[PDB]
Amino acid sequence: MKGDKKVIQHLNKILGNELIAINQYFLHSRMWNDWGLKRLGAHEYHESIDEMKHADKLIERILFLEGLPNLQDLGKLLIGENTQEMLQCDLNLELKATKDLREAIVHCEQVHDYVSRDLLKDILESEEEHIDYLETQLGLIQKVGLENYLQSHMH
C-alpha cells in the first residue's frame, strides 16, 4: 500500500535509532556479564531484545508501505566505561529517541497515517518505560551507594 514518503523517512529514522540501541544495549549487557554483574546483564539483554521487537515492527510497516527499510546506516554507539556511565549513555540515547518519535507522530497525524502513529505511540510508551527504569537506577546509585547498587546486581 503506497505510503507517504516523509512518513517512511521518519520510520527509517526511528529504525536507525533502534538499531543503535540494539547494539549499545547488547554490548553493555555482555560487559556487565563479564564483570559478574549478571542481574544488570540480564536486564540490559532484555532491553536489547525489546528494541529488536520494535525494529521488526518498523521494518514490517516500512515494507507494507512500499518503502525500503534501511539497516545499513548505523549511527554512533554511546558505550560507557563503568556502570554509571553506561546507564547514562543509555539514557542519553533514549532521550534522543523519544524526541524523534514525537516528531514522527506529528507528521503521521498531519497526513492521516493513523496506523503508523499508533505503532510509534506504542514504541514511545516502551521507551518512556525504559527512561523510567534508567532514571530510577541512577537515583538508586545515589541513595544506596555504588558498591551496594553493584552488589544488588551480582546475582
Ligand X SMILES: O=C1NC(=O)c2c(NCc3cccc(O)c3)cccc21
> What is the binding site for K ion (CB under 5 A)?
148
Residue choice 49, 68, 74, 106 for contact with ligand X (CB under 6 A): 68
Residue 109 parent element (H or E): helix 83-110
Report the nearest approach of a second copy to the CB of residue 91 (Å).
Answer: 9
The span from the CA of 93 to the CA of 101, in Å, is: 12
Footprint of a second copy (CB under 8 A): 1, 19, 23-24, 26-27, 30-31, 33-37, 56, 59-60, 63-64, 69, 71-72, 74, 76-77, 102, 105-106, 112, 114-115, 118, 121, 124-125, 128, 131-132, 135-137, 139-140, 143-145, 147-152, 154-155
| Contact predicate 18/55, CB 8 Å | yes
The alpha-carbon radius of gyration of the chain (Å, integer) is: 17
Q: In the block, which residue shows the cell 497525524?
A: 109
